């Protein structure tokens, strides 16, 4: 009847398989947020993004393409 | 009366629980070459269960004291029984004083 615990690494792995768009926050930059498709990650969860657009508080989207986001900055990972 | 055994309960959450390390002494075996003899010596009479001592003098080792500290063997003649008893009496007097 209990629900099985899911560790975060498997959560990101699942997101990788489902190709779910994500909304990545940042460590201190509150207003800048990044979105795109996740394409690869490591144990330190450096995130390799696809279709990375730099969305802002006023939705000032800017196309960044495929980028590597160093793990030190990701505060939150959103599912769509 | 337990509804679910603690065993099935323990397994049923995260059946894929994993631990990578091995027990502490893994390459060894629970019985070595000299284990049987070591256990035999562990429960031996006083001189033989030590491996370290202090080299008593030659005359300070009685070698047959346990023969008469125990009971007399049965079916012995009268004089032997009396000898057992008298040696025991001398030992008791020695210990009392």
């Amino acid at each position: 009847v209990q629900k099985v615990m899911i560790p975060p690494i498997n959560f990101i792995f699942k997101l990788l398989q489902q190709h779910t768009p994500v909304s990545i926050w940042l460590f201190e930059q509150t207003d800048i947020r990044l979105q795109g498709q996740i394409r690869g990650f490591d144990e330190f969860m450096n995130i390799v993004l696809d279709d990375a657009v730099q969305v802002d508080a006023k939705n000032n989207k800017r196309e960044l393409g495929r980028i590597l986001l160093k793990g030190d900055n990701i505060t939150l990972i959103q599912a769509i | 009366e337990l509804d679910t055994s603690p065993e099935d309960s323990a397994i049923e959450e995260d059946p894929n629980f994993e631990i990578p390390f091995d027990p502490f002494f893994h390459s060894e075996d629970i019985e070595f070459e000299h284990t049987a003899s070591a256990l035999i010596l562990l429960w031996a009479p006083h001189p033989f269960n030590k491996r370290s001592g202090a080299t008593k003098r030659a005359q300070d080792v009685p070698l047959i004291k346990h023969w008469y500290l125990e009971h007399c063997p049965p079916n012995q003649p009268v004089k032997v029984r009396v000898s057992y008893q008298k040696l025991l009496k001398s030992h008791v007097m020695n210990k009392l004083h």
Binding site: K3, F27, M45, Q78 | -
Partner: protein
């Protein structure tokens, strides 16, 4: 070496998380890691104004978690 945080009592409960920079997120905890990386489902985000925007499934880095709070009596 490292050590597993004690959070089994907080699993599958309405929990409130404070992040760095005065962030605040609701949700029910669904997992945790060695570095206190947590996973939330059906969570809700608060802003400074206070309007509640549903945020979704969430995987916060543990480095940013300030506190984890529950409200039940």
């Amino acid at each position: 070496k490292a050590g597993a945080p004690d959070l089994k009592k907080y699993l599958d409960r309405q929990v409130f998380v404070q992040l760095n920079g005065s962030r605040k997120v609701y949700g029910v905890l669904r997992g945790y890691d060695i570095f206190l990386n947590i996973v939330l489902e059906d969570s809700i985000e608060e802003k400074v104004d206070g309007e509640k925007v549903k945020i979704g499934s969430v995987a916060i880095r543990g480095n940013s978690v300030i506190m984890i709070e529950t409200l039940d009596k």
